[PDB]
C-alpha cells in the first residue's frame with residue numbers, strides 16, 4: 001500500500017533481527033518501558049538498546065547494572 005520506515009519512536013530505531021514482545025523485561029537492564037523487544041544470543045528478550053547494541057557488537061550494552 002504505502003509502507004515506509006517512519007521512525008515515530010525517536011530514539012528507538014533498530015530494525016534488525018526481530019520485532020517486539022509488548023509487556024516484558026530486558027534480559028540485561030530489566031527495563032520494561034520498551035516497544036521494541038529484540039532477542040539476545042539465547043533468544044532472550046532485550047529492550048531496543050540491548051538488542052540494538054548486541055546486533056552491532058555481539059555483546060550486551062554497557063549501560064547500568066541489571067536493574068539500573
Ligand SMILES: [Zn+2]
Nearest residue numbers: 026029047050
Ligand atoms: Zn535493555
